[PDB]
């Protein structure tokens, strides 16, 4: 699911709705763009 993000890897505050709703913590490659979102869910964008 598509999620609102603030920290798009290198180019941090550019493109808001980017991140995907991931569970807790992200694998290397998936850059924590909204590190925490809800309950036990976080939002990451792949490399960008």
Curated annotation (Swiss-Prot):
Disulfide bonds join 3-43, 5-33, 26-44. GO terms for cellular component: extracellular region; nematocyst. It is found in: Secreted; Nematocyst. One of its GO terms (molecular function) is toxin activity. It comes from the Eukaryota. InterPro entries: Anenome_toxin, Myo_ane_neurotoxin_sf. One of its GO terms (biological process) is regulation of signal transduction. Gene3D superfamilies: Anthopleurin-A (2.20.20.10). Keywords: Disulfide bond, Ion channel impairing toxin, Nematocyst, Neurotoxin, Secreted, Toxin, Voltage-gated sodium channel impairing toxin. The keyword Ribonucleoprotein does not apply. It holds the Pfam family Toxin_4. Binds specifically to voltage-gated sodium channels (Nav), thereby delaying their inactivation during signal transduction. Is highly toxic to crabs (by intrahemocoelic injection), but without effect upon mice (by intraperitoneal injection). Belongs to the sea anemone sodium channel inhibitory toxin family. Type II subfamily. This is Delta-stichotoxin-She1a. It comes from Stichodactyla helianthus (Sun anemone). The lineage of its organism: Eukaryota, Metazoa, Cnidaria, Anthozoa, Hexacorallia.
